[PDB]
Paper text:
The same approach was also used to study TFAM and the most significant digestion delay was observed in the reaction with [name], where more than half of the protein substrate remained undigested. In particular, [name] is still able to degrade β-casein, but more slowly, while it loses the ability to degrade TFAM. The stimulation of the ATPase and peptidase activities for [name] has been notably reduced to only 1.5–1.6 times the basal activity, while that of Y394E is still of the wild-type level, although its basal activity is lower. Cryo-EM maps were obtained for [name], Y186F, pCMF186, Y394E, and Y394F with resolutions ranging from 2.9 to 8.5 Å (based on the 0.143 cut-off of the Fourier shell correlation curve). Tzeng et al. found that unfolded substrates interacted with the β-stranded subdomain through two hydrophobic patches, however Tyr186 is found on the opposite side of the domain from these patches, so the drop in proteolytic digestion exhibited by the [name] and pCMF186 substitutions is unlikely to be due to direct interference with substrate binding. Tyr186 is, however, surrounded by negatively charged glutamate and aspartate residues from both subdomains, putting it in the middle of a large, negatively-charged patch.
One of them, ATP-dependent protease Lon, is a member of the AAA+ family (ATPase associated with various cellular activities) and is responsible for selective degradation of unfolded, oxidatively damaged, and short-lived regulatory proteins, which prevents their toxic aggregation. Functional hLon is structurally organized into homo-oligomers consisting of six identical subunits. Following its [name] localization, Lon’s NTD specifically recognizes and binds protein substrates, which are then unfolded and translocated into the enzyme’s proteolytic chamber formed of the ATPase and protease domains, where they are degraded into small peptides. In this study, we investigated the effects that phosphorylating two Lon tyrosine residues, Tyr186 (found in leukemia cells) and Tyr394 - the only two found in its NTD - might have on the structure and function of hLon and the effect of polyphosphate on hLon’s stability and activities.
Numbering used by the authors:
A (entry chain B): 464 to 949
B (entry chain A): 774 to 949
C (entry chain A): 464 to 525
D (entry chain D): 526 to 587
The structure:
């Protein structure tokens, strides 16, 4: 075990920027930030000699190409590759081996990585960093810190092998679908890159240039026998697949290619020209026949954008009058409110703040409207949004409560996300790009965002912001003139 | 497999504690309820209340009455919320007393407003209903393909009913 | 234990689809999805040559 | 991000006494400070023991 380890053996690293740039572009679509960061890394390493190894993490929805882009980076840089599923782990021993006192004790897994790669400047991937239990007899995060410290990593040693080994030239990648649960000490030490979903156009491009040939090769097929139209892929994306990722699209394309291969072997068509008419037999029938859960937004229900752990979503904040408005015409009782959605205490406080603001705003605008003051109401804000992004539904909550008070439905194909501050001031929120792609995928044409988030919508591409009559606000009153124009 | 579970509702307390009383008609739920299913039961409760208020405003039963509902267990938590429609119709029947139409089954999630979402186990629930001997089955519209992907011999003897909103169901179980 | 292991020994695999389909229909009724999935697996393994191994689960009532 | 760790390093450099760091935050078990009983299979001493071994000094800067 000691001898098989490389010692001073550094894998030759690619340094030409154009070549690695082209490799990354041909192995992947989009991901401009990741490719630019790798180009900066190569430029630094070529401008400072020794092949330093920098740490970073890729945060984004699944089925986006994090493992694939890391593999492409290992390929382009010419350095080796090795991954590790840290998710749900509770035994640090595998990273440190043992004390050597066991029967044939093994070293740490990084020792195995160095042995297999045979070189001391490899690419290492860590998947499900956010899923670490860090429970009893575990706490591997500390070891991870020991690994990811810019200075301590240089003297890393194992329980099995107490000799130190340099981990400064080793490049580290980490992948997660959310940035909150990952430990803060581990969070700070490494930078954080956003690979954020795809719209139908990006998914179609990825499928036609990366998924279809890949699965044809997987199914032992050629570009002539199995033919898929871009229209077929678009229809599949719209109806057979509803998420920000690409994984389910991969499953469907693999299924159709499997059926095509079977039809070629035992069937009659030496080659197949897949079309939607034939897509029905190749896959089945549309699963998501509805673009949205609602299309008119009746009174008391409003669309909102949620930055759930898996990309973005178009949730529907709903309200109902759960008691007769007039128990006693003289009665000056409080219009109690019930809230559902598995809400935390911060969510409950935000709902209370939105309730107070809605009452005040009605009293300012419709003083005779005692509906909100005197009515027992129930609002359901669907869960799924991360707790940090949850308070972004206050704007929805307010407009939905107003609509219920006056009965005026919110404007159709309208989505919003923002945070109220007990007076109407709308604050910036996170997950702007995921929410934008969700709204685009849901048919939203008008979108309301805080002014402070304007940039996170303007830094987006142009083909991701077509038909979105954006509405940038700082105070809630403006929205009342948008959601309720008349 | 699948089963047919009879959701039950009872008035576990006197309706007229005080004629002028404006107290909430609280509801208790049995069936080893999880948090998600408890929230689904609450949502169905409020939806049924609002539905009565709209359809029968003079009916204060669901509002001024303390009720108990039991959903028989066996269903996995994922499929649990599918009984929201059953809960709503059971509460409505207890409110008006009109017994639900016989040989009628239903399953579908509710969204605090009556919109009905697709549910899983369509084939398994269909065979459970067929073995149970029903004729009218209510399913979400979005589940329709999952019911039409079944064989032909597996659907005779029942009149399927597809829906995307609960009002249609109120027009089915309570035709009169 | 080390020597008793089959090293490089691969059980000969049926590849014809008619006979396998008839066998599946003879030994069972229904399960059409499973039967056609096995047919597709055999077709893929035959087209690509080597007897590829694949993972799949059968979920249903006991 | 003010320079507490940096100025502790500077103090260790100036005094010439060795330096070592120990993150006690988010920590529950006392084992990492006092090791183990030496009887548990694969037992380890306290992290301070590792510090004393590494520094090769009796008066380092922890």
């Amino acid at each position: 075990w000691l001898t098989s380890i490389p010692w001073g053996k550094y894998s030759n690293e690619n340094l030409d920027l154009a070549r690695a740039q082209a490799v990354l572009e041909e192995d992947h679509y989009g991901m401009e930030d990741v490719k630019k960061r790798i180009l900066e890394f190569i430029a630094v390493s070529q401008l400072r000699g020794s092949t330093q190894g920098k740490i970073l993490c890729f945060y984004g929805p699944p089925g986006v190409g994090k493992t694939s882009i890391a593999r492409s980076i290992a390929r382009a840089l010419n350095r080796e590759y090795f991954r590790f599923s840290v998710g749900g782990m509770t035994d640090v021993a595998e990273i440190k081996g043992h004390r050597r006192t066991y029967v044939g004790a093994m070293p740490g897994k990084i020792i195995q990585c160095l042995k297999k790669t045979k070189t001391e400047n490899p690419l290492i991937l860590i998947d499900e960093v956010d899923k670490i239990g860090r429970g009893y007899q575990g706490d591997p995060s500390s070891a991870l810190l020991e690994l990811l410290d810019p200075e301590q990593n240089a003297n890393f040693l194992d329980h099995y092998l107490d000799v130190p080994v340099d981990l400064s030239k080793v490049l580290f990648i980490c992948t997660a679908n959310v940035t909150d649960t990952i430990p803060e000490p581990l969070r700070d030490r490494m930078e954080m890159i956003n690979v954020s979903g795809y719209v139908a156009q990006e998914k179609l491009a990825i499928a036609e240039r990366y998924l279809v040939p890949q699965a044809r090769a997987l199914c032992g097929l050629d570009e002539s026998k199995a033919k898929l139209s871009s229209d077929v892929l678009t229809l599949l994306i719209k109806q057979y697949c509803r998420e920000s990722g690409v994984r389910n699209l991969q499953k469907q394309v693999e299924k159709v290619l499997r059926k095509s291969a079977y039809k070629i072997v035992s069937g009659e068509a030496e080659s197949v020209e897949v079309t939607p008419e034939n897509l029905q037999d190749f896959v089945g029938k549309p699963v998501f026949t509805v673009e949205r859960m609602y299309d008119v937004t009746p009174p008391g229900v409003v669309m909102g954008l949620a930055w759930t752990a898996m990309g973005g979503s178009t949730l529907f904040v709903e309200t109902s009058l759960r008691r007769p408005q007039d128990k006693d015409a003289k009665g000056d009782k409080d219009g109690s409110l019930e809230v559902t959605g598995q809400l935390g205490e911060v969510m409950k406080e935000s709902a209370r703040i939105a309730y107070t603001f809605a009452r005040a705003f009605l009293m300012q605008h419709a003083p005779a409207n005692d509906y909100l003051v005197t009515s027992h109401i129930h609002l359901h804000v669907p869960e799924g949004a991360t707790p940090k992004d949850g308070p972004s539904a206050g704007c929805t909550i307010v407009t939905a409560l107003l609509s219920l008070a006056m009965g005026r439905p919110v404007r159709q194909n309208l989505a919003m996300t923002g945070e109220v501050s007990l007076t109407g001031k709308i604050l910036p929120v996170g997950g702007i790009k995921e929410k934008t792609i969700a709204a685009k995928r849901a048919g939203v044409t008008c979108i309301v965002l805080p002014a402070e988030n304007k940039k996170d919508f303007y830094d987006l591409a142009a083909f991701i912001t077509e038909g979105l009559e954006v509405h940038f606000v700082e105070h809630y009153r403006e929205i009342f003139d948008i959601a309720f124009p008349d």
